[PDB]
């Protein structure tokens, strides 16, 4: 109702987050980066093949439950 499930994947590591529609995605990208022992700015985060700024929230991107956020390496 106030929360949404998202999956962040890089092709080999998949993480499910249950986060508020109003929470910024900076924490989600940060958690995904930390679990790989990297910083968030080293990774490209894409929704619908479009990059995501950290300040944006799932409500700001019209996202739905079970939506996928792809993760790649900067300068891939």
């Amino acid at each position: 109702e106030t929360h949404i499930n998202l999956k962040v994947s890089d092709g080999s590591s998949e993480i499910f987050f249950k986060i508020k529609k109003t929470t910024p995605l900076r924490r989600l990208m940060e958690a995904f980066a930390k679990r790989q022992g990297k910083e968030m700015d080293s990774l490209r985060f894409l929704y619908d093949g479009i990059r995501i700024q950290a300040d944006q929230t799932p409500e700001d991107l019209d996202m739905e439950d079970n939506d996928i956020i792809e993760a790649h390496r900067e300068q891939i």
Binding site: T2, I15, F17, I19, A31, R35
Partner: peptide
């Protein structure tokens, strides 16, 4: 804490 650091207390406060 969950992956992004939400304790049950944070959930109770938000709700």
């Amino acid at each position: 804490q969950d992956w992004i650091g939400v304790t049950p207390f944070d959930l109770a406060v938000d709700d």
